[PDB]
Amino acid sequence: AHIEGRHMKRMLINATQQEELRVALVDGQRLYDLDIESPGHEQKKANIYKGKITRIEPSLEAAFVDYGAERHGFLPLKEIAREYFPRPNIKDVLREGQEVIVQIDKEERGNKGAALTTFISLAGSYLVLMPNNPRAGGISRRIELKEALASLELPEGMGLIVRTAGVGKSAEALQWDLSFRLKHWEAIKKAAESRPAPFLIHQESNVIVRAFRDYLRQDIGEILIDNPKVLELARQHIAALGRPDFSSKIKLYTGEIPLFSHYQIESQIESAFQREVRLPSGGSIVIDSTEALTAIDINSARGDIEETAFNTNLEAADEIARQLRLRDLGGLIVIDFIDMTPVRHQRAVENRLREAVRQDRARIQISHISRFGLLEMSRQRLSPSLGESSHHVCPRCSGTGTVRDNESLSLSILRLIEEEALKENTQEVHAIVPVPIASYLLNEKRSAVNAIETRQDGVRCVIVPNDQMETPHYHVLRVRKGEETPTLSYMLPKLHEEAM
Amino acid sequence: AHIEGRHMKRMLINATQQEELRVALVDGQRLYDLDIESPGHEQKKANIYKGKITRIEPSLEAAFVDYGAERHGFLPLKEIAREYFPRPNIKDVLREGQEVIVQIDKEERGNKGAALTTFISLAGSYLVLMPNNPRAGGISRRIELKEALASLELPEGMGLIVRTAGVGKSAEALQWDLSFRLKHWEAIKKAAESRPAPFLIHQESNVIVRAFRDYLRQDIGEILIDNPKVLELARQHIAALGRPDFSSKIKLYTGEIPLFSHYQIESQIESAFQREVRLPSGGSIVIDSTEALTAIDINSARGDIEETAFNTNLEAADEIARQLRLRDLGGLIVIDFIDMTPVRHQRAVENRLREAVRQDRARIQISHISRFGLLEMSRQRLSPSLGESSHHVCPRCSGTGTVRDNESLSLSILRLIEEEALKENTQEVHAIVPVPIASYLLNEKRSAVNAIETRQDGVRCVIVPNDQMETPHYHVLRVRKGEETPTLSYMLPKLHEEAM
Amino acid sequence: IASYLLNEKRSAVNAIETRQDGVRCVIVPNDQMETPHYHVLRVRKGEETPTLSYMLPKLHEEAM
RNA sequence: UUUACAGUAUUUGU
Ligand SMILES: [Mg+2]
Ligand SMILES: [Mg+2]
Ligand SMILES: [Mg+2]
Ligand SMILES: [Zn+2]
């Protein structure tokens, strides 16, 4: 019967394992957010570079940047600063080879490079400076502050935003921040004026600093840390981050029972990695990701039908909202709630979902339930998903989740063999295939194979079982007249390795 | 530049392989429909049985039937015949153990049994008899026939439908059909009156008979068959099916180059089995199936952007329409066309799709492109999809298409080991895991494992690499005090086999 | 062999590492060998990599 | 992590 407010919200930092630093927001024992960092795979979003313009595109109204990755970043027209420009075409604003101050809006995904803007933003605890453009500024829509904002001394060419954490802080306190921002900016444009033009300038902070900078509302009761050395670092991060009011709140955890286990969130953390997640009342949601989009289905538990569909869909809306966050799912998401005949049920389920994602930091947009029962929504990509970052594509099935049955596949291969055997100038065709495929072709289909060889007089069909493949994989190589060897059937895979 | 009408439409029947009988409708060399049948996995839709009512459900307004499968069929209220009933509740109409004449509307899918109706329908070449209800009848919406329908002599309690193939046939010709139907019906209700009440009554015809009964429009030029014995059978099927006008059209194929290869449809047939399908101009569609639904994405080729998105989306609409048919995709389908800024583009793409599925036999419903760029549609399930029928769930990934990385997984297991080790009365915990998982835990994580054993004084953590697993799979078994053996670590998997 | 060394003999392996302060003993199970075969390679100071234990056989293939 | 003067309610009537 979760109600926000009942239990303490806490920040649990588990840092006993070098290879995975974990930060969890927990409410009582209810995990509602997670962040995991490991050496090497450190974050690149909100780094700043000195990049040189590679190639221009009026076609796309943007241009490409060598910021120093093996792959170049993508820089849209709407993102180039009036100050960098000696509605127009991009062919008009920037030159090829031209240096420029660049920030990463979005990490590389799939094939794309990274979206960049020249409109750099510098986040502090209470403020975000946009030294590069005045057009921007204001109050966290989550909120005297109008009154205190006006009083800071911001340089003409720039605007700024008061953060959600500003709520409880005063003017002079914002200025302390506003400045550290300006310092940094000065250092930035200077560490750039003094070089050539492809290098990193500012590395975004690690997962604890980020947590502290971005996740510490007032309603965070305690920050538990399970490792002394790290804890000490944390204290310095808080102070340095201008948040004395949290010092008392940081506490070393010392139980023998590991932190995350003591607060019982380990199974909830694991739920992020599962395809199916049980709901409180017995049903579940099933999350599938596809090329286009993430699809989520909903099943009920095992009694009013109408009431069951409703209560289950409501539970699902809650669970989806957190799975979205834990899994860092982004982009298009399509939800298949159980059918409800009463329209008012449909609105209530939508509203439940709207409510449930209100605390999410990612921008989100939801629509209504379609006449087919689908709800479409979009969530902003804050960082790569669990799938991209802790998984890899199945090596068996190639992401497809299924495997063609042996006979189906065998007959496919058989037809492919015959086609090859028909081509002019063919001397042999070698089919290299999984063991059971070989079995089936050379027993169940021995006649066919025989017929092929007899119709195509003089053509050898060699079909070799290869224990180094499993089914779906195979090769059918064609051997032209004159280029055959006296190689043994079963030493044949190895021969073709230098393909295959 | 395909235009319907240019080339001959043909029916190609490939029957040289005992284990897969294939029927293709081809237009010129363009495959537009496929059907594949193999011994054993014969069709069950439109079989008729004598079933006994198992259990009733006012909750669902329907009841269950033992028609003789291991699993019982599902029989909705709207489907029970006024004649079988000695708006009400189902608790009111049928008794438990009560015999009844039952037809299969839909094959078993997943967990469901099969949807059944008592409103039996008997399809002939030109007519469909619904002996069980008059409320039904008319003209193929694809079409003197009003005038000739009236003239048949149909028994009062029953209605009938004139098929699309009726177009070119006369009255007396419908009667010839109308009767063979009535004969059959008589035989049906008689082979039922004379037994007890769980048995098969009528087995639906095989894939060639069905093809002939259901797919032979006038615009079918030739029926090629590549096997003499089968061809002879076909002749009898046509005659028996009352279609002399097709006799001249059936022709033995005799090339050495196999039929489907001569007409170049083998690669198109194969496209049905691929996740990605190239479009004429270079782009492609990618088809993913999920618990909820089938998702299709669309990519473009490598020049007006607006024009490219449009032309590609149009090509896709065509290809999707046929993939839907070839793959026998049914249920909810969601299509992610490339973004188009001009709304008129959006309508044109929708309309293209509507047009492209007009020839499909399955009922279909399309909606508009959403504000998120998605198009939702539904297609009636005519029979199981390629996925259900020629594939099986990946054995590696369990349908998920991905595999958790080794370190991620290892740390998961490590935490699970420690939890087990903490429980009262624990003597040892055995973790049985893939080779590389073992490597990582027992090297990279050897300290952790060590610490666990030292904190939990007296608890053995045995972590054994097992070459019979690959990663995601593993077992963590807990061993209580007193129940440990002196078994060797590596003979341990085998011990637990009688689990595990 | 890996199983036995890293379970039945885990203490010994541990002791070795503790007596020889600073020396890593990496023992990796390799499904491409069966028993009698094995390799024990020594890695000098300065020439170690940050290679994962189980990607280690493959590294040493260009021996081994 | 985003843009003002405004708009009213409480109050006001021996
Ligand atoms: Mg797309
Ligand atoms: Mg559903
Ligand atoms: Mg999948
Ligand atoms: Zn797989």
GROMACS .gro file of C-alpha atoms in nm, chain B residues 69 91 128 141 183 204 214 437 473-474 498:
model
   11
  569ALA     CA    1  -0.771  -3.326  -2.790
  591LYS     CA    2  -2.529  -2.152  -1.686
  628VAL     CA    3  -2.100  -2.182  -4.816
  641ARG     CA    4  -1.850  -0.847  -5.107
  683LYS     CA    5  -2.560  -3.437  -4.846
  704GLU     CA    6  -1.088  -3.053  -4.339
  714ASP     CA    7  -1.045  -2.131  -5.219
  937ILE     CA    8   3.162  -1.717  -1.519
  973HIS     CA    9   2.226  -2.023  -1.721
  974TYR     CA   10   2.342  -2.127  -1.374
  998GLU     CA   11   1.892  -3.505  -1.018
   0.00000   0.00000   0.00000
